[PDB]
Design a protein around this nucleic acid. Structure first.
Lengths: 130, 51, 173, 162, 196, 104, 118
RNA sequence: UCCGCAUGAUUUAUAUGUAUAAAAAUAGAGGUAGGACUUGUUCCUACUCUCCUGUAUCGUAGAAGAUGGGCGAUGGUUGAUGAAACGGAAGUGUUUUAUUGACUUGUCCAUGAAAUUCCAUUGAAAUCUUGUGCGGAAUCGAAUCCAUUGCAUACGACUUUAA
RNA sequence: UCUAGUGGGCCAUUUUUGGUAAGCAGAACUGGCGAUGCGGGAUGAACCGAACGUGAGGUUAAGGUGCCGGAAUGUACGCUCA
């Protein structure tokens, strides 16, 4: 279902841009592709397919478009929100928050999990009697 | 005398014992206050690119 | 990594010719010392000049004017085989001619067991017209509606999860 | 033969920026290991800490700054605590080495409830009284101080934020 | 990075040498390893090549006394055991202790079918061999070199599979009720604030 | 009372192909799989805990202490120096890496 | 006398003295044409060398920092009156019980430590 | 030799939560009641849940975890038994019910952890054996040598018989 | 000035002669073993690296980093089914 093509939205996995979102604007060969992002800290570059993982979003982007046109198409469409409103982005954001939690937050999570377990066990037992 | 060798590059006291000018030495002097021209040259650029 | 240098040299002026000619070469070498060595290596084969009797008047590293543009590079080489010498032509899609030269060296080593010492780079040019492209494999990458599946890779490795000895479940594709 | 005089001057110790007074920290060694306590002040290189004695049982005591893990928990107002009273002389044992013997069977008289002098529990109550209102203001902070830190399966101290 | 007491490995889909190397390293590190379904191990190369390799190994016996000569074990678990022994310094006390800490069996016997079974990604055939490359099964290789328990293992494995399917479905129903109750909890928003 | 130490395994001594140096021990720390991550555990106290047959001071538990000095390789293995060199019979035995010289 | 360090505590046993009873434990330098100990092959025994010499300050000193001066009579103990902090008294093994008691009492009066006392 | 005793030692303890049992393929239907309709090589139902592989899930606060409460369901954990059922590949384990104990931190309080006043240690219950008062009766065996036979045999050994 | 031992050599690179060839015989240069331990080539008198007092710490040479075995089941591009 996922293929390498011009306008395909991809997620970077390896390198200093790990976890960022970009779009393929040109295909160099079968091992490297030229990608760009509207972010001001993600320069247009050439990356290998092993360092990225393809997503399910395909844009209507002309081949070899410049940075300004790519950003305009990115903003005209809902690519940022289309990716965000997905299981992949929500799970990745949840992992980011969990990794950023400190000891006090973990203690709060433990307390909340205790309350949830008590409520779930009561709910399961109550539903068993119906 | 001189039971132990100190490295002047690490011990600033020895770096002051030797080279008294090190106190007044000034590095990172800025000299790009001018217009900063581009001395490239038409002939130089044509030869640089060439084939 | 390799770098591209322009090297301009000339014979040391003598009584016979106070004004010797200037010769320039574009060479791909890891550093300037190798570039100058390559310049004298090629100049000794053409002119009656050596390093002792000649000099290097200029050397400048050349960067890619358009490193963000995908291009096709045609490379003509002359290489020595175990039997004789052959001239070959190669096409590589890359953003820099340095990268194209590096790909050429890797391909020649992999496909012909040809070392650096046995390869002479005759010419490197940038192909502009589509019909100029000679290799069908290279020309098939110029289709605007190009679409191929992700090439096979050894899954996604992690700095820690990849080093993990055991996995609870078998990975899927 | 008197030896030479070493050129080793004594200079104050600069502790970490995460060991500021009022910080919640985890004890790593000793009897109270794994306990979360509140830093009152830094004497020379040790933190004069006390987890609220009414919530966890840790008294007012010193702890080496190396044997302490600083937590990113919200700060507890400690400016009202009289930290000037706590000096190295305050946390100093009576001069024993010398005219005393290492006689055993003295653990009975050395045990608490009779070996604790006056004004020590008094300052413990005073420090606790000045600290509890801010502790109870922050939710889950009293329970956090009462709880004991521990490592579970999969926990990696080099990657977790404390 | 696994410091478990005992690790149980499903040998299915694993390459013999790479799994043996991983197991041997774990044994030297001090971890007890149990390998199940050794008859489902995979060896790269076509069956004729592997059959010839085993026959060449089988031909090597002591000339003056085969009774004290090399002992050629046909069972797939013993083939894996021989591989691990080769990668271990078995002629020392440390190597002997590491080898004795290994238990390789055919199928999944009653001691281990009710325990978690993990896999070694570094030895998985699917991600270590090119698609289209021929490979053989140690169970088939064993059966053709003199292993006489291929059918009974298959029948017992089928019985274990249907029992495990029933157990999985029962656990599936239980996890459903827990998950359905979990979706109606009153602390989901606060947990999501922390990312849970 | 619970666990306040990181799990570790005593792999071997610092050694060449045929020469061993028992003064330094190779330690594999659970969860540490990089030489950059080994920097956190550098300088940490590490102990080997074993039980004997004769009680000493009313206890059969004997502990040999040590300190992590430098990382080893690229896979998070570290070098450890103990007060008494670890016995070679303890290859593959468990070790406890404490947090006593904490800096966080 | 302070911070005494021994470079080696092994006695440098002779080669093959463990194998043969006629070969004594006292060190002898191997002079064979094919000797492996002389050539210092890896895994063989070490040979005494000048590099093993201990520090001059701490040489000849007992673990307490003193040197065992042999005493055969009372006058030998009086020889150590001034050198109380460097020399200890070692009573000779052929000294009778009466003279040993006299030597011990004189050394105690002079403050001289005795190694073989009691 | 079993039960009761009540003690010591041992270690499960290579322990420190040493918790987690579907199967199968890898350009697949991954499967997660997967959804979906009639058990059908139909689904157009769900269409993104797959692709952070587990950095997951369960559990984790309380003098090594005490002493008393207000409320919240009407549950949960762990032992002593009960009728048991299902487990044979090495089943030595997994589940339902009933009698009957201990704990419950689901939320909110009260008292007590110190002087072990800066680290250099292990906290206890239980499971298997023996070191001893013994109440309860003891239901209870064999092998070999010395003998014997020759279906055996250098000697051992082997096949018989025996009181 | 006096005197000891030696007056059987051998190996490797390069240049060779005699020989069908030889782990053969004989010449030239250099480095070695003999008298040279140590790291590597699984092993080895000569090959590679390197010439050694007793130790601590650090870094390398030649050589290696799947397990035995200390060190990436590292990264990038290709070829190969025997």
């Amino acid at each position: 279902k996922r293929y390498v093509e011009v306008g395909r939205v991809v997620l970077v996995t390896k390198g200093e841009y790990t976890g960022k979102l970009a779009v393929i604007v040109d295909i160099v060969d079968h091992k490297r592709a030229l990608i760009d992002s509207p972010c001001s800290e993600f320069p247009r570059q050439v990356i290998r397919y092993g360092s990225v993982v393809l997503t399910h979003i395909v844009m209507k982007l002309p081949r070899g478009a410049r940075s300004g046109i790519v950003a305009k198409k990115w903003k005209a469409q809902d690519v940022c929100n289309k990716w965000a409103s997905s299981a992949w982005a929500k799970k990745l954001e949840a992992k980011k928050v969990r990794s950023q939690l400190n000891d006090f937050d973990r203690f709060a999570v433990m307390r909340l999990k205790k309350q949830r377990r008590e409520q779930v066990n009561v709910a399961v037992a109550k539903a068993l009697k119906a | 005398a001189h039971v132990q060798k100190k490295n002047p590059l690490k011990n600033k006291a020895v770096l002051a014992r030797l080279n008294p000018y090190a106190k007044a030495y000034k590095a990172n002097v800025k000299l790009n206050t001018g217009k900063t021209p581009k001395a490239a040259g038409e002939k130089f650029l044509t030869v640089l690119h060439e084939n | 990594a390799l770098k591209e240098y322009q090297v301009v040299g000339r014979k040391v002026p003598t009584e016979h010719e106070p004004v010797p000619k200037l010769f320039r070469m574009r060479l791909f070498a890891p550093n300037e010392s190798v570039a100058k060595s390559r310049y004298w290596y090629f100049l000794k084969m053409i002119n009656k000049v050596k390093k002792a009797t000649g000099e290097i008047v200029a050397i400048n590293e050349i960067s890619e004017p358009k490193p963000l543009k995908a291009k096709v590079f045609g490379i003509w080489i002359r290489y020595d085989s175990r039997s004789g010498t052959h001239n070959m032509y190669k096409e590589f899609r890359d953003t820099t001619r340095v990268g194209a030269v590096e790909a050429m060296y890797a391909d020649m080593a992999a496909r012909h067991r040809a070392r650096f010492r046995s390869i002479r780079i005759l010419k490197v040019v940038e192909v502009e017209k589509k019909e100029d492209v000679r290799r069908n494999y290279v020309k098939q990458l110029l289709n605007p509606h190009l679409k191929f599946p992700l090439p096979h890779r050894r899954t996604g490795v992690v700095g820690l999860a990849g080093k993990k000895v055991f996995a609870p479940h078998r990975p899927s594709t | 033969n008197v030896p030479k005089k070493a050129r080793k001057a004594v200079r104050p110790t600069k502790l970490r920026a995460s060991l500021a007074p009022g910080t919640v920290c985890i004890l790593l060694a000793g009897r109270f290991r794994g306990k979360r306590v509140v830093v009152l002040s830094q004497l020379e290189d040790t933190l004069v800490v006390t987890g609220p004695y009414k919530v966890n049982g840790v008294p007012i005591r010193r702890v080496n700054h190396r044997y302490v893990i600083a937590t990113s928990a919200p700060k507890i107002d400690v400016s009202g605590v009289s930290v000037e009273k706590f000096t190295k002389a305050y946390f100093a044992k009576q001069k024993r080495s010398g005219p005393v013997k290492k006689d055993e069977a003295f653990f009975a008289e050395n045990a608490p409830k009779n070996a604790l002098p006056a004004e020590r529990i008094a300052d413990q109550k005073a420090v606790d009284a000045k600290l509890l209102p801010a502790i109870k203001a922050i939710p889950n902070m009293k329970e956090y101080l009462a709880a004991s830190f521990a490592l579970s399966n999969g926990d990696r101290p080099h990657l977790m934020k404390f | 990075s696994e410091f478990q007491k005992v690790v149980v490995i499903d040998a299915k889909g694993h390459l013999l040498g790479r799994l043996a190397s991983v197991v041997a390293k774990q044994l030297l590190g001090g971890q007890k390893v149990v390998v199940v379904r050794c008859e489902e191990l995979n060896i790269s190369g076509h069956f004729f090549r592997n059959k010839l390799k085993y026959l060449a190994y089988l031909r090597k016996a002591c000339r003056y006394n085969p009774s004290r000569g090399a002992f050629h074990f046909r069972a797939p678990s013993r083939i894996f055991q021989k591989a691990v022994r080769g990668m271990l310094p078995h002629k020392t006390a440390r190597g002997q202790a590491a080898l004795e800490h290994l238990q390789a069996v055919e199928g999944i016997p009653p001691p281990f079918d009710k325990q978690k079974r993990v896999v070694v990604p570094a030895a998985l055939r699917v991600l270590r061999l090119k698609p289209g490359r021929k490979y053989c099964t140690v169970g088939r290789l064993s059966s053709e070199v003199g292993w006489k328990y291929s059918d009974i293992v298959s029948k017992l494995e089928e019985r274990r599979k249907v029992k495990s399917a029933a157990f999985y479905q029962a656990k599936l129903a239980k996890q459903k009720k827990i998950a359905s109750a979990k979706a109606a909890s009153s602390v989901n928003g606060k947990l999501a604030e922390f990312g849970y | 009372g619970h666990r306040l130490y990181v799990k570790a395994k005593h792999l071997s001594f610092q050694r060449s192909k045929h020469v061993i140096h028992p003064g330094t021990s190779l330690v594999k720390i659970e969860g540490c799989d990089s030489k950059e991550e080994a920097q956190f555990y550098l300088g940490k106290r590490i102990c080997f805990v074993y039980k004997s047959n004769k009680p000493v001071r009313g206890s059969k538990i004997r502990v040999i202490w040590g300190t992590v000095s430098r990382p080893h390789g690229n896979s998070g293995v570290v070098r450890a120096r103990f007060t008494h060199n670890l016995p070679p019979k303890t290859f593959g035995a468990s070790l406890r890496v404490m947090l006593y010289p904490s800096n966080v | 006398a302070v911070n005494i360090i021994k470079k080696r505590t092994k006695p440098f046993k002779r080669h093959q003295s463990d194998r043969f009873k006629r070969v004594g434990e006292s060190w002898r330098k191997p002079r064979g044409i094919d000797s492996c100990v002389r050539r210092r092959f890896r895994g063989t025994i070490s040979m005494p060398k000048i590099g093993y010499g201990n520090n001059k300050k701490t040489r000849y000193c007992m673990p307490n920092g003193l040197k065992a001066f042999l005493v055969r009579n009372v006058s030998d103990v009086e020889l150590l009156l001034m050198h109380n902090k460097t020399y200890a008294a070692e009573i000779a093994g052929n000294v009778s019980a009466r003279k040993r008691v006299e030597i011990v009492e004189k050394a105690r009066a002079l403050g001289v430590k005795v190694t073989n006392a009691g």
